[PDB]
Design a protein around this ligand. Structure first.
Ligand SMILES: COc1ccc(Br)cc1S(=O)(=O)Nc1cc2c(C)noc2cc1O
Ligand code: NA
Length: 124
């Protein structure tokens, strides 16, 4: 079991720009999630080798994490806030797909997702 290559964080020919919503996504939303107690499992791509999860990438084909998101935001990878939001949704959804209701990790995802949804209500 090897790890796949992580998701891209820059792409010359993918349309990209800066928006004040995307700035907020970085400065406020991502920063709040990043510093939360429960951030740690979601700060980097799932290392299926070191975490001993050899079925992870059998089940999850569209992986996403906050390390990847942070870098995409810092590089202005996105065209709009909706693309970034979709990456967050993918992250949480993957957690819920791979794991089971009530699992420690699922409860952490849920608390981060509540907090995410609260912060994207205040999107300018
Ligand atoms: C068994 O390892 C656990 C147990 C509970 C928690 Br909260 C976290 C881990 S882990 O971070 O060492 N491994 C692990 C990470 C993820 C991710 C990210 N999505 O689903 C996972 C399942 C895991 O066991
Ligand atoms: Na599941």
């Amino acid at each position: 079991g090897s790890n796949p290559p992580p998701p891209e964080t820059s792409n010359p020919n993918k349309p990209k720009r800066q928006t004040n919503q995307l700035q907020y996504l970085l400065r406020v939303v991502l920063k709040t999630l990043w510093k939360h107690q429960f951030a740690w499992p979601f700060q980097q791509p799932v290392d299926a080798v070191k975490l001993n999860l050899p079925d992870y990438y059998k089940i999850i084909k569209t992986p996403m994490d906050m390390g990847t998101i942070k870098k995409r935001l810092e590089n202005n990878y996105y065209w709009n806030a909706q693309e970034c939001i979709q990456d967050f949704n993918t992250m949480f959804t993957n957690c819920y797909i791979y794991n089971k209701p009530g699992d420690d990790i699922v409860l952490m995802a849920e608390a981060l997702e509540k907090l995410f949804l609260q912060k994207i209500n205040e999107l300018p």
